[PDB]
Structures are given as structure tokens and as C-alpha cells.
Amino acid sequence: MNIFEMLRIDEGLRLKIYKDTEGYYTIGIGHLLTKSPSLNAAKSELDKAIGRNTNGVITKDEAEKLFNQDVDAAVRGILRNAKLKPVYDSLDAVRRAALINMVFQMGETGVAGFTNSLRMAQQKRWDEAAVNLAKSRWYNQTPNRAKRVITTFRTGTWDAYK
Ligand SMILES: [Cl-]
Ligand SMILES: [Cl-]
């Protein structure tokens, strides 16, 4: 298992514009187009992203290219964040994937707010971090997904995804 397969499981794959768990226009593999209530705004965002008049539908190959970019951006966002980098550097490969998943979903800033959890993880207090991670809007809004990431983070195994 790896980051790509992991996120593909958590986000799914859609080729037509859709609304996410929060009402935002998204497409492909969890690619947020816009926070705006506007479909046109979203179509415009899609064409700009894809580089063509899409008419709100992309191809699998298109979805995969956006996904590659987003993963890449997630990692580099981590490596450039001062609070995040040191944590990431301290973790094993599986747990690092758990961190990338979170940043993919909620952004560098959102994640930078799990301060307490982050510090515990740095100290390798798996259980306490896991509990702390659970006390969040994040877990309450998307529990099953949050549950999988937290287990991965706690255990450093892919069990939750097997
Ligand atoms: Cl983009
Ligand atoms: Cl969920």
C-alpha cells in the first residue's frame, strides 16, 4: 500500500463536477475546485486547471494528473511548513503517509492546528495523540475516514486500509 492508493480509497474518483462532504465543488480524486456556491465559478476553475474547455467532465487520465500534482503539493507544503517539517522528519514511512493524507484533506494550515497532537506524535506517544486527534471537528464530520487515518498514525501499519 502507499499514499496514492490510500488517498484513492479515502477520496474516491469522480469525473464530473461534484459537491463534497461540505458542499464544495470538487472533481477527480478529491480535487477542490472552489469554495464558491457558483457552478460557473467551478467550471471556470476546472478549465483553468485542466487547460481546456471541459464542460465539467474530465477524463481518468486528467483526474490522475490533478491527483499527482495535489500529492506533490501536499508533500512540499509539509516540507516547507515550520511546524510540520520537524514532525514529518521524525516519523517512519507509514505514519508520514498519514500526515500527507491529513494535509491533502485539510491543508497545511488546518493541520498546523493539531498542535497538541503533533507534539505528542513527535514524542511518539501514539495513544495520546490518537485520542487528541479524535477531539476535532474533523473526526466529527468524517469519522470513518478520520478513524482510518488516526489508526494509521497511531500504529504505523496499513491495517485500517486492509
Ligand atoms: Cl491546479
Ligand atoms: Cl468519512
Residue 2: CATH number of its domain: 1.10.530.40
Q: Counting ligands in written order, which one lies closest to the CA of residue 22?
A: 2
Residue 73 CA, ligand 1 centroid: distance in Å: 10
Active site residues: 11, 20
Q: Counting ligands in written order, which one lies closest to the CA of residue 147?
A: 2
Which of 92, 95, 93 has its CA nearest to residue 129? 95
For residue 70, give every residue at least 6 positions away whose Cβ sits within 8 Å of its Cβ, in sequence order, or none. 29, 30, 31, 104
Element spanning 28, H or E: strand 25-28
User: Is 117 annotated among the ligand-binding residues?
Assistant: yes
Please give the tally of structural domains in the chain.
1
User: Is 67 annotated among the ligand-binding residues?
Assistant: no
CA distances from 16 to 39, 41, 42, 58, 124 (A): 12, 15, 11, 7, 41
Please name the amino acid found at residue 2.
N
Q: Counting ligands in written order, which one lies closest to the CA of residue 32?
A: 1
List the domain range (segments joined by +) for residue 104. Answer: 1-162
Q: Solving technique for this entry?
A: X-ray
Query: Could you tell me the sign of the dihedral formed by the alpha carbons of 63, 75, 33, 25, in that order?
Result: positive
Helices (H) and strands (E) in the chain, counts: 9, 3
User: Is 136 annotated among the ligand-binding residues?
Assistant: no
Residue 66 CA, ligand 1 centroid: distance in Å: 7
State the greatest distance between any 2 C-alpha atoms of the chain, in Å, as a whole number: 50
Q: How far is CA 112 from the centre of its chain?
A: 13
